């Protein structure tokens, strides 16, 4: 609460690199002057890097393993892209065009751009906007959880998901009051912006599957296919 807040913080901090574990060996500060196979493979590799991490993070959210197994899977699948983006935006340093991935790998915008396409600029724009809110770690630990624990079509126990959402929203509300209510509304406003960004992700994967230089890994492909409402 209390403990909830602390459990949520501990789960967030254990899901990402220590500042000490950052890896700059591939980082190129000046990128020399048409997407190829290596760019597409890296795109899928970067996305796949978060899969196990977000799963283990979710499992540490109190209540989440008390949802039905099918609702756990559906929540994770539906939120994956949004969670990948939000955590990336928050971890990264958009004033330097530095992307920081959950493995600790650091890359410059231009080293990713051909894989991600335009979407990476949209993600950096959202990241600079996220950074201007100066969201502290506890608030972010709640927000990220709220991205995951939210209503989706096909949940078996939507009310229990709603109750867990309420608990976390309450936790966040109280925390924001303690530290400092339009801040709260500003924070919460990032959730719909994130969805709209997730859409450009689905557009980029669609384009890549069309192009078919390298196919998406099975797990990313499944998320894509299951998250299509047609």
Domain ranges of the chain: 1-230
Are 214 and 44 in contact, with CB atoms under 8 Å apart?
Answer: yes
- Way the structure was solved: X-ray
Alpha-carbon distance of 41 to 137, in angstroms, equals 32
For the chain, the straight-line distance linking the first and the last C-alpha, in angstroms and rounded, comes to: 40
CATH class of domain segment(s) 1-230:
mainly alpha
Helix axes 137-148, 158-179, angle to 10 degrees: 170
Angle, CA of 209, 211 and 215, to the nearest 5°: 45
Task: Please tell me the distance from the alpha carbon of residue 123 to that of residue 200, in angstroms, as a whole number.
Answer: 10
Measure the CA angle with vertex 109, ends 104 and 113; round to 5°. Answer: 115
The DSSP call for residue 156 is S
Query: Of all helices (H) and strands (E), which one includes residue 108?
Result: strand 106-108
- As a whole number of angstroms, the distance between CA 211 and CA 192 comes to 29
CA quadruple 161, 162, 163, 164: dihedral positive or negative? positive
| CA 104 – CA 109 distance, rounded (Å) | 15
Helix H or strand E segment including 107: strand 106-108
Pairing type for strands 98-100 and 106-108 reads: antiparallel
* Cα angle value 182/122/109 (rounded, 5°): 125
Q: What are phi and psi of 52, to 5 degrees?
A: -70, -40
Hey, CA dihedral for 108, 109, 114, 116, is it positive or negative? Answer: positive
- What's the CA gap between 136 and 131, in Å, rounded? 10
Helix axes 190-211, 119-132, angle to 10 degrees: 160
30: Cβ contacts below 8 Å, ≥ 6 apart? none
Residue 99: which H helix or E strand, with range?
A: strand 98-100
Instruction: Give the whole-angstrom CA distance, residue 71 versus residue 82.
Output: 17
Residues 51/80, Cβ–Cβ less than 8 Å: yes
Query: DSSP character for 215?
Result: P
Kindly give the residue spans of alpha helices, DSSP state H, lying in the chain.
Answer: 3-14, 37-49, 51-59, 69-91, 109-116, 119-132, 137-148, 158-179, 182-188, 190-211, 218-226
Distance CA 31, CA 99 (A): 14
């Amino acid at each position: 609460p209390a403990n909830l807040l602390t459990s949520l913080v501990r789960a967030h901090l254990d899901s990402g690199p220590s500042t000490a574990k950052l890896d700059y060996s591939k980082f190129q500060e000046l990128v020399l002057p048409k997407e190829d196979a290596g760019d597409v493979q890296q795109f899928y590799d970067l996305l796949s890097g978060s899969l196990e991490v977000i799963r283990k993070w979710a499992e540490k959210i109190p209540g989440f393993a008390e949802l039905s197994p099918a609702d756990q899977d559906l929540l994770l699948e539906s939120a994956f892209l949004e969670l990948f983006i939000l955590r990336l935006a928050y971890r990264s340093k958009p004033g330097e065009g530095k992307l920081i991935f959950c493995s600790g790998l650091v890359l410059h915008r231009l080293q990713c751009a051909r894989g991600f396409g335009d979407w990476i600029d949209s993600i950096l724009a959202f990241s600079r906007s996220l950074h201007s809110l100066l969201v502290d770690v506890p608030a972010f630990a709640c927000l990220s959880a709220l991205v995951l624990i939210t209503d989706r079509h096909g949940l078996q126990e939507p009310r229990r998901v709603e109750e867990l959402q309420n608990r976390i929203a309450s936790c966040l509300k109280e925390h924001v009051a303690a530290v400092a209510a339009s801040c709260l509304a500003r924070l919460l406003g990032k959730l719909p912006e994130l969805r709209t960004l997730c859409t450009q992700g689905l557009q980029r994967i669609f384009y890549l599957k069309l192009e078919d230089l390298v196919p998406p890994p099975p797990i990313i492909d499944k998320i894509f296919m299951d998250t299509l409402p047609f």
